[PDB]
Symmetry: D2
């Protein structure tokens, strides 16, 4: 039949099971609800999508913990967002987010962020700007790491063009890891639908990204060393993430990834609504911070 | 006499929100294990196997799911709820049927202890059949706690809850040992001006009868602060540093049960299986074939 | 007499006495020789000047510790720099750097950096670019902090224009502190020469900066929240700086403020010289890092 | 008999360069005080007042300038140099005239100890008039140290320096107590295959004669690692966390002298004056008017 065209990207946060890897610390609750310093882990990737201009977001979690995410985040109306929820009853790979989220995505562009990924740095809005404005193909970011063998790894030719992707190579071609933020056009659901499980029994995002690379439609932007990309894969790195955020916030008197603040600065909520959000937390430092936002110019 | 244990892992208000909006803080990790493993381990080191866990109504199933009936660790665990956070002394009303005619010990669910000869420091406390025992610890900020005043001879002469002008820098820690009088003492308490049933009022009732032993927990012990986001982080880094230096874990309940002979090598081996692919199960397996002094 | 004109900025690092403030930790050696994680504190501001394109640099320190800085840094030839040394026998204020450094500066533009100031973030080169290219007036940077009362504080009007500077105000007009990096034109020595000591008995850099502000020649650029500016004023903040750097380096496998690296990337030293510098440290991680630089492309 | 102390604060090679290019690492701070305050404090807690500080030729004046002749802290300090880092046992050759006919104790200048009843753990070691005493501590990485092997009955039966296949996870810590035999034992040592005069060879000489006491330093003690940039940082954060929780300092020599009655209140007051405007002098002044148990 005839369609009519007259595009506005949706977000997905994958906040499912990290298995038994961090047990016993994660036996009672999902990793993405653990605090990083002063706020739940999922605030950080949520703030990243909000900074990209994305207001319609799907949170994917385990059946057990979906109510906890819903109690925390609600339907998003308090922050000028619309949040929906889906369950992932078995952790079958990152690319499953597109099958789980097929009806949510519909015919729109999308962005996937991992619920345990934290980003920090200057001009990040503009880094997210470039990817968000590409209405065709896929956009990912590459970041120099110590241990690229843990990640999807990008190989560049002498001219700096991305030429191959390898998932967890034993002998990485570079130290550039693909970060856990991915922008896709309308092709991604069909690409994901045709994936077959890897030997590990997982639907791999690296295979989705290679499909775009083979089409000549993968943009790989470098996220430079002046940004911090942290992912909280071990108890040690979780502690380090906490200390990192605390050092920054206590130095600056500003918070990293405060969703209320980002919504207020994006003009998705106004002063009066921000005042209402501050009221219940008025006796703790978080509520006091929200109140200070109303009567301070921050450049 | 038998001494039963109680862990009070109740509601911390909105003080650490939004970090604790989704889950009570005693279920959050300090480094590599749930916070509640630490006070549970303190009770187990004191020789206590029958333990009541008190939490909010919402989070009890999460404590029940986490720890079970205790049989896997040679423990006998029970659960109860504190509907509203109306004072630590409420633990003894909630736990009255659990305690019965036995001796008791209460530990706060967010308190972490570290140091040498803790098994022996708890032992002296545990073996007193009469009176109550508490521990006093020198802190920077005594006004946050129950504060002990001593006379020139070193005798405890008063207790004040959150004094505006503290009489000393010695705070009462979150571990309390009680004889058979405590339930009856708790039952006669009235709410404070702040509206709570105060453990300090329980402790003063013992003090007035000369039945409160206040032992100093020395500066060589760590009693770690988890009252702020800052202190939470510091405690994690503290545990991290010790464990990574030593290759030994702090407050591993499976290990403590094994060393107490509450479970045998065959049971420890079964416990190590599920987590065999990560650091915790690996640690438990190594316990079977290493002598640790 | 007649002059002839046919400009190339010099750097000064003030690494003098921080008095008895951090005693006993600093009784045996200067604060600016204390390590921040894996390298001496002074590497960080030195790297900042190098990133600004500055190769001719004066290090000002106490008479007692000048030999220690000289043993560490030499005459700079190893890194494609020219380093000179001057002493500050009494800590009489930051603005004294221009009197001490008068002959060194000569008729050139200059930049002053505090020897205990660390900077980190994306596009910092370009932030330093704007200030370095202003051949007239002065340039400073303002950074939102928790405790502006400890600093020189900038007041902005509703349009964002800097309108006043106050040194350690009890009731700060804003939370924007002036950071410890200052760019000056040829007027600064004369401005400094005419300063009188403040009530505290110090020649104040805030007075130098106000002189420029009153002339309409002070540029105040915002250093945004996506940058880290740390200054190591307490034992606590020193520890935090150390942890911050360690988290970044161990995540990335890249070093912050490695002068050898910056000189190599600026083409002030070539591959062969970098190889020579790596040789003496070849058995430790620092030397191994220098060696890796030669056979890796870092974007 | 009198027991004299030695702190070996010698050269650490190029291992932590460039961080330590300008100054030896034992003069760098761990949090709020020079690293050497920590092992110095360990000797003072052991009751030792006559102490020889051994350092590189370049940095001795910096140790001399820092600590003086010790008279301000009720100590008797002397200095000597180790020209080349050719083994820890060289301390006994360098210190031979200092030691004379007395008992001795050696502590490494980069070793930090924390825990309860340390004064008493050093006391038992200090009061043995014959033989040698060392402490063994469970670590993650025994291959970095002198490693102790025990038989099934718990008896130390061998020592190996940096074994490729360690026999246990028990490392010998950097505190050693010796009788009058050690100088003569050190004098007869030959360099190892690695070219050093090994303290482990000294300790094995005592072991062969059944005169080596190997006491376990339990997991409730912290023996902190300052061998890497990472472990340096961890130690600082460790001290920070304790001191900020307690409002008491770890290894404050002025405080320890005061408590040992080696200096009186009038002397402590004079010591507090110079630093009266910062946290350290403030701490010292507060010591005059607070009872700390
Ligand atoms: C729309 C204006 C947003 C300004 N902003 C911002 N960019 C960030 N950056 C953080 C967010 C994701 C981590 C980088 C932040 O944490 N808080 C903010 O208020
Ligand atoms: C019955 C033998 C138990 C020995 N033990 C022990 N004492 C502790 N320490 C305690 C002291 C600080 C809280 C943990 C521990 O964490 N794990 C153990 O296995
Ligand atoms: C000329 C190319 C330099 C690239 N670079 C760089 N910009 C920094 N940024 C750091 C330096 C001052 C702290 C920000 C660094 O630490 N190491 C580097 O190699
Ligand atoms: C003679 C009474 C001394 C009491 N004392 C003491 N034991 C220590 N602890 C020691 C144990 C860890 C190294 C510091 C300390 O740091 N400061 C002190 O004043
Ligand atoms: Cl960058
Ligand atoms: Cl103690
Ligand atoms: Cl920014
Ligand atoms: Cl112990």
């Amino acid at each position: 039949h005839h369609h009519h065209h007259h595009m506005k990207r949706k977000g997905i946060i994958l906040a499912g099971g990290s298995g038994t890897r961090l047990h016993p610390a994660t036996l009672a609750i999902s990793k993405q609800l653990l605090p990083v310093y002063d706020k739940p882990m999922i605030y950080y990737p949520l703030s990243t999508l909000m900074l990209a201009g994305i207001r319609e977001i799907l949170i994917i979690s385990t059946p057990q913990d979906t109510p906890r995410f819903q109690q925390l985040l609600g339907d998003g109306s308090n922050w000028g967002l619309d949040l929906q929820y889906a369950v992932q009853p078995s952790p079958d790979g990152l690319a499953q987010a597109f099958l789980i989220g097929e009806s949510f995505i519909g015919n729109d562009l999308s962005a996937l962020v991992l619920g345990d990924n934290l980003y920090y740095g200057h001009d990040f809005h503009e880094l997210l700007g470039s990817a968000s404005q590409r209405q065709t193909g896929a956009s990912v970011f590459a970041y120099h790491v110590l241990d690229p063998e843990r990640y999807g790894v990008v190989e560049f030719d002498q001219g700096g063009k991305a030429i191959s992707l390898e998932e967890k190579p034993l002998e990485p071609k570079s130290n550039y890891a693909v970060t856990g933020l991915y922008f896709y056009d309308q092709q991604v659901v069909d690409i994901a639908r045709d994936l077959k499980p890897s030997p590990r029994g997982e639907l791999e995002i690296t295979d989705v990204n290679r499909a775009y690379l083979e089409r000549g439609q993968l943009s790989v932007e470098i996220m430079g060393r002046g940004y911090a990309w942290l992912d909280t894969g071990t108890h040690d790195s979780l502690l380090e993430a906490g200390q990192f955020i605390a050092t920054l916030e206590n130095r600056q008197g500003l918070k990293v990834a405060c969703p209320e603040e980002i919504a207020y600065r994006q003009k998705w909520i106004d002063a009066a609504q921000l005042e209402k959000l501050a009221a219940p937390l008025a006796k703790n430092g978080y509520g006091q911070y929200l109140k200070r936002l109303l009567t301070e110019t921050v450049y």
